Each structure stands twice: as C-alpha cells, then as structure tokens.
C-alpha cells in the first residue's frame, strides 16, 4: 500500500475538498466521528482505503489531507461542521488576511510568511507514510491563494519530494458564479509557474458545472454547495482507483502513464453521466450503451468545447455500478461507427476500461438522484485547447492596457513576469495545434 496526501488551497480548494471527504466517508462507511465499523484491523493495516485515511489506536480513521487558506472564515466551517471530529488541528492551517484575488500577494507577499508552516504540516503526514505516492492539489485559478500560494507550494513540493507525483483539481474561472475581474491574470500566472511541476491536472469549469446544475438538477440559481457536491462526485470517480481494489490507475504514476504522453500537455477532459435530479418523480435507468454514449455529448463535459475538431491521445472509462465488460465493448463499437473519434497517428486507437461494482454514493438530502450505473471518461483531447484560448484572449485585452498591473507590481512582482508567462501560454497553444490540426 502507498499513501496519497491531499492539499486544499483557497476557498474553492477547501470547500471542494470538504465535500469530497464527506463523500469518501459515505463511500467507505466512515462515521462523522471517524469510526469505521467494517474495518476489522484496528490501529493499522494496509488496505486500499488506507491510502487516503490513517488509523489511530482508538479506531479513528483520519484523512491524509491538509487545508490551507490565508483567511479563517472558510476553514472554520470545517473546524465546526458535521465532520469536525475527523480532522485534527494540525491539518487545518489559516492565516488572517487573504490575498484579495491577487496572485502576487499569494505567491510573494503573504505566502512567503506561511510557506514553511504548510511544508512542516505536510511533512508530519509524510512521516506516517510507509510509501508516499504523491499529492493531490485542489485549488481555484481565480483566487489569489489558489493561484498564488498554490504555485509556490508546488515549486517547493518538487524540491522536498522530487520523485513524488502531484496531480491537480483546478477550478477554471467562469464569470457566471464569480464577481471578480482580475481572474484571467491569476490563471495565466498560476499555470506558468506550476506547469513544470504538475504531472496531471483535471480542470473543472464553473460554467460547465453551473449549467449541469440548471439543465439536469433544475436549480435556478446554483450555489457553491450545489456545485461542490457535483464536483466531488467527479473527484470520486477519478480517485476511486486509488481507494479500492483493482488494477487501473492503482497509483498516481499510472495517471501520467495512461493519460499523459507528452509532459506539457497534461490536461485531460472529464465527462460524467448520468446526472439525474432527485426531485424527479422517477427516472428510467439508462443502459450501459446510453451512459457511455453520453460521454460524447458536450452537455456532460467538465469543460465546454468540441472534441469533434480535435485529436485524442488517450481515453479512460471509469464505470461504477452495474456494468459488465461485454456491454462496454458493444457500446464502444456502436460509438465508433457513429461518432468522430480521431486519435493521433503516433498513438493506438484504444480505450482503457475500469469497472467498480459499487454504484455512485449520493449524499443524503443532496441534489443528485441515486443511479444504478454511472461512468466518468477521461480523455486527453486537443479540443481542450479552446479553454486556453478564451483565457488568453482575456489576458491580452487587459494586459494591452496594463489594467490592474499595479496591484500585482505593488506586491514586489515584476511586469516582465506578465509577458514572460503570457509568452509561455502562447507556446502551450502552439503545442496543442502541432498535435491536433493538419
């Protein structure tokens, strides 16, 4: 068994992770007070769920996670919520004033005074691990912390844990749920300083999660609670291979091995289905060919874009529930003859399939209905390049006038790091076009 440490940076990172560890305890049968009746090995053991949870002498199953925020309001929710007895105070770290949506404030000014503290707390968790696999970093591109302090943490993690793997769960900024303006700057700044240090990042667009809350769940004004409960459902499907028995995506190394051929192009796309409203009278259960066939509809993409005009480099199908391999192959064959699935010539045209018989656990009193079989597809598509273009265009429209550049320059940062990072993104879009277009 090899452990996996979780790190949540910023409000988005903290809240999301908080909903995740709620879903984890329900999926593994872990009570709010930490007790796990099914766990017969008391005080220790090398089971598949122990990669996320540790065990005390008193039978308390504690997560291997860390919550870091520069303002205490969001983390105090964890210090007093339903699952307050899970974490101990070491894992919850809070500053006093935030980075005011400023990246320079999260990377330099403020982050400099707390960076050593977070590493010391992450160290304590690594000291319990017999074989640390790496870290999963949850953060937002928009926040000053999730963008600024995250990159600084990532840069350090590569120094103290060189051979370890680091995955990301990044919240891509959507103006529909955000009242900020300087988000395009933070995003391009955090992606330039974290690129060489992240082995695989899964982007979630608040705009995509938002619509799925209105179109499928019939929620007129989705809140962060609605958005988080859905995001954690995807986080669960992508991390169950590390928390259960199986052979597909068993350790963090296999995420890059299976999903990332080229180093800089490490941004898969996530597609999930079904998403049914609990308020519905009652839904006819979809077949395996139906939920699988839905993994190609944009409405169920964690990032809005058109893969029909891109090329694939990898493709994983993580099923959960009543799914048999026979049905997966048939559904796959039918999808090829109808869909446009163009792979790159230097990669085989294939799919890696993983099946977990436990259906998706739904939070009691939640927005999602209980389904008999759900699937989450991960696929490295050059179509995801659409997301970098939109964000780059906004960076240019503002930077062309130096709008807001003084708040950043006023925290010690140099203006060159704006064009220095923008030049890098211009290269990233250049790599996607070399691999997808003719």
């Amino acid at each position: 068994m090899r452990e996996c440490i979780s790190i949540h940076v910023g409000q988005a990172g903290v809240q999301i992770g908080n909903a995740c560890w709620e879903l984890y305890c329900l999926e593994h049968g872990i009570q709010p007070d930490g007790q796990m009746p099914s766990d017969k090995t008391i005080g220790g053991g090398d089971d598949s769920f122990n990669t996320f949870f540790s065990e005390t002498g008193a039978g308390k199953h504690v997560p291997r996670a860390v919550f870091v925020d520069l303002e205490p309001t969001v983390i105090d929710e964890v210090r007093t919520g339903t699952y307050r007895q899970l974490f101990h105070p070491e894992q919850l770290i809070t500053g006093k004033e935030d980075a005011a949506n400023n990246y320079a404030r999260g990377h330099y000014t403020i982050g400099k005074e707390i960076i050593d503290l977070v590493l010391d707390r992450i160290r304590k968790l690594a000291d319990q691990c017999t074989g640390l696999q790496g870290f999963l970093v949850f953060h937002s591109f928009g926040g000053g912390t999730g963008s600024g302090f995250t990159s600084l943490l990532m840069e350090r993690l590569s120094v103290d844990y060189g051979k370890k793997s680091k995955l990301e769960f990044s919240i891509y900024p959507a103006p529909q749920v955000s009242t900020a303006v300087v988000e395009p700057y933070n995003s391009i700044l955090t992606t330039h300083t974290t690129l060489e240090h992240s082995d695989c990042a899964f982007m979630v667009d608040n705009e995509a999660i938002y619509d799925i809350c209105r179109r499928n769940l019939d929620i007129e004004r989705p809140t962060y609670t609605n958005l988080n409960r859905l995001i954690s459902q995807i986080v669960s499907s992508i991390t169950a291979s590390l928390r259960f028995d199986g052979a597909l995506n068993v350790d963090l190394t296999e995420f890059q091995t299976n999903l990332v051929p080229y180093p800089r192009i490490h941004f898969p796309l996530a597609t999930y289905a079904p998403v049914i409203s609990a308020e519905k009278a009652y839904h006819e259960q979809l077949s395996v060919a139906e939920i699988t066939n839905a993994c190609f509809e944009p409405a169920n993409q964690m990032v809005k874009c058109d893969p029909r005009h891109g090329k694939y480099m990898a493709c994983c199908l993580l099923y959960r529930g009543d799914v048999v391999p026979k049905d997966v192959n048939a559904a796959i064959a039918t999808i090829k003859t109808k869909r446009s699935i163009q792979f790159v010539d230097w990669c085989p045209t294939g799919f890696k399939v993983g099946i977990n018989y436990q259906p998706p656990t739904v939070v009691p009193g939640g927005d999602l209905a209980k389904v008999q079989r759900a699937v989450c597809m991960l696929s490295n598509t050059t179509a995801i390049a659409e997301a970098w273009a939109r964000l780059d265009h906004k960076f240019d429209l503002m930077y062309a006038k130096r709008a807001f550049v003084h708040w950043y320059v006023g925290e010690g940062m140099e203006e060159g790091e704006f064009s220095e990072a923008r030049e890098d993104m211009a290269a990233l879009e250049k790599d996607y076009e070399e691999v997808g277009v003719d």
């Binding site: 935030d98 005011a100 529909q176």
Partner: protein
C-alpha cells in the same frame, strides 16, 4: 474578524456618519444603547466589522468623531444615537476651521491631529486583523476637507498597507455654504488622488436635484440629503456587513474595481427613490432602469458621456436571483457602447436577503466611470474663475500658504481630467 475603523470629520462628515451609524445600527438590530434585539443570526454574523464587543454583550460602534468646533458633536452626543458611540472617541477642538482648508490641514487642525491619531491607535491595536479605514466628510469646508486630508496623510504613514476609503461630499454652488468651496475641493482632490484607495463622490447638486425633482420635495434641507447618503452608504457596505457567497474585504473589492491607481473615484447610485404610490412594490425591471438612470445617480455626471471601467450592482430583498441575472444582462447588451471592451466581465451583481428598513427590495450602484471627470471639470472651472483674480486668497495666505501651492493643486486636477480623457476614447 476583519475590523473597519470609521472616521467622520467636520460638520458634514459627522452629520452624515451620524445618520450612517443610525441606519446600519437598525439593520444589525442594535438600539441606541448598544444592546442587540434582532431576530436573525445574519445580523450578528459579521457584526464585528463596524462594532466592538464591550462588556455585557454591548456593541459600541468603532467610530472616531472629529471636528475643530464643539457644535456639531454636541448635537450628536445628545441626538438620536448619541449614547451608542464611545465617549472617548469624541476628539474636538474649540477654535473651528472657518471653512478654510489651511486651518484644518496646516494650523488649527495640525494642533489637534496628534490626539486623534492616538485614538485611532487604541481602536487599531485591539483590532484582530484590521481591514482599513473609511472616512466620511465634505471636501468644501475646513475641518473635514482640510483636517480630513491631513488625517489621511498621517494614517497611511503609520498604516501604509491598510485600505483607505472616503465618502467625500463634493460642493456645489447650487447648495453652497461659502464661496471658497472650489478652493477647498481642489486641494483635497489631490490628497485623495494620492492617499485614498476608493473615493465615493456625492455631489450636493445631484443630492439636491434628486430630492427636489424626483422626491418632489419642494424645500430640501441638509437632513433630507443626508437621508440619501445614509441609504447609499448602507448599500455599498452590505458586502462587508452581511454573509453569503460574497465574502469580501476592502482590498479584495478595491482590486477588482480600480484598474488604475489614480482612477479610483466611484460615483454611486441608489434605488428606489419614491415620493409620498410609495407602497407600490417596484418590479425588478423598474429598479434596474432607475439604478442605471442618470437621475438616480449621486455624482451629477451623465454616464452616457463617459465610459464605465467597472460597475457593481448590489440588490437587497427576497426576489429572483434568476431574473436579476436577466435584467442586468439586459441593460448591458442594450447599452454596451458605454462599457470599455478591454475589461472582460466588468459588470457584476450581488444579492442580499436582508432589505433596508422598510423596503421590499433596493439596489445600490457602484460605478467607476470616466464620466466622473465632469465633476472635476466644474470644480476646476469655479477654481480658475476666482484664482485668476486671486479672490479670497487672503484667508489662505494668512495661514501660511503660498500662491504656488494653489497653482499646483490646479495643475494636479487638470492632469486628472486629462488622464480620465485618454481612457474615454
């Protein structure tokens, strides 16, 4: 606990801040004795932003009343919410400022400034994590304008990393106390361009024309004007006083609202503004048409003449946050030629469940428009009309000022208008 230190200076600064504390004390459910008597926990959620917690569950506003004469503060202490304030936060002299910017900034005000900064230090030291300072005052008098700017110059020196917002009432010959109001304004405007992160411009002519014409008030008075500013100040501070998805501090708000360090002068608006047909529930489309209407703005500037860099609207009351996104996203896509197309998504909206006292719903408007240059153009005109003849300068040269410093304040404000201009094209 993100505390804010409130300073109100001068006759206007105190009379307005007095009603301000009288307005938000009612929303948070705090009687004139500091006792809480509300029925909702949202009232106490972020209550420590403006109120300190004393013994016996008493809530004492974190304000510092400043003036160089006793009159205006004798009425506050003995007025409606006079007892709520801290008895020691009353810092005042006896000579007065004689509506002279030099007496508040260089001579009389300089003699008292130290004792005020000592009170500020008592309120700041006990702050768990200070957000910043907000100052209410007028820019056409002596104390608030003169000593107010001095008090800002000395607060940044001791707190160079704290945010500083001002509610600055601009003078207007249509509602004029003295003829030297252009001078006192031009001198402070440069101090605000330098040492303030956010200045809300509140023209008295707009406030007067808003009462006379819209509110059908035949004979407006200073009190009636202060009612508007009270409702407006309450509106813009909602994000910092009540909870919800919108978690914000002054720096977080200033970062998204001020694209250039010197163009931080906001012109606010409020709705509804109904005369006594006053109980008719105002539809969402009605609040959004007035809130974006020139007649409903308090800077006396025609927005259609300039361009918006950023615009924020905050609604209050139990309404449809879905229809809200619709009506706002309507006015934008119907009058977009007035928004700069190089700041993506500059128009944003928030919703608060707690409405002002006695309103099904309201809407505050916080605009950062280049059209505010019209406000600095009228001042500069009235200034030059007198300064060219050196009229009334003896009140100032007698206090120790040179004519050179007047020519500088003029040139500094003319640059401000030039800087606002290049962004309008």
């Amino acid at each position: 606990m993100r505390e804010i230190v409130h300073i109100q200076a001068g006759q206007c600064g105190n009379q307005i801040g007095a009603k301000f504390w009288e307005v938000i004390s009612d929303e948070h459910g705090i009687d004139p004795t500091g006792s809480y008597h509300g029925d909702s926990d949202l009232q106490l959620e972020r209550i420590n932003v403006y109120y300190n917690e004393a013994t016996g569950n008493k809530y004492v506003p974190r304000a510092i009343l400043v003036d160089l004469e006793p009159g205006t503060m004798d009425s506050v202490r003995s007025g409606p919410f006079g007892q709520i304030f801290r008895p020691d936060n009353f810092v005042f002299g006896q000579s007065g400022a004689g509506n002279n910017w030099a007496k508040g900034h260089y001579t009389e005000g300089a003699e008292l400034v130290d004792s005020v900064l000592d009170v500020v230090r008592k309120e700041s030291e006990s702050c768990d994590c200070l957000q910043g300072f907000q100052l209410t005052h007028s820019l056409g008098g002596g104390t608030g304008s003169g000593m107010g700017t001095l008090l800002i110059s000395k607060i940044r020196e001791e707190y160079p990393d704290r945010i500083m917002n001002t509610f600055s009432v601009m003078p207007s010959p249509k509602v004029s106390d003295t003829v030297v109001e252009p001078y006192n304004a031009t001198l402070s405007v440069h101090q605000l361009v330098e040492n303030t992160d956010e200045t809300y411009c509140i023209d008295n002519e707009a406030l007067y024309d808003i009462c006379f014409r819209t509110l059908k008030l035949t004979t407006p008075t200073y009190g009636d004007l202060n009612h508007l500013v009270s409702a407006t100040m309450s509106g813009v501070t909602t994000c910092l006083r009540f909870p919800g998805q919108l978690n914000a501090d002054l720096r977080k708000l200033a970062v998204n609202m001020v694209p250039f360090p010197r163009l931080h002068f906001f012109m606010p608006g409020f709705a509804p503004l109904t005369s006594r047909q006053q109980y008719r529930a105002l539809t969402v489309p009605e609040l959004t048409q007035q809130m974006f209407d020139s007649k409903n703005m308090m800077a006396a500037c025609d927005p259609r003449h300039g361009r918006y860099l950023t615009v924020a609207a905050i609604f209050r009351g139990r309404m449809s946050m879905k229809e809200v996104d619709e009506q706002m996203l309507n006015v934008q896509n119907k009058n977009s030629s007035y928004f700069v197309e190089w700041i993506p998504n500059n128009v944003k909206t928030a919703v608060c469940d707690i409405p002002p006292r006695g309103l099904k719903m309201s809407a505050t408007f916080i605009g950062n428009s280049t059209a505010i240059q019209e406000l600095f153009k009228r001042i500069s005109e009235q200034f030059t009309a007198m300064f060219r003849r050196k009229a009334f300068l003896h009140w100032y040269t007698g206090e120790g000022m040179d004519e050179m410093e007047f020519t500088e304040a003029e040139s500094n404000m003319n640059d401000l208008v030039s800087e606002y201009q290049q962004y309008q094209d």
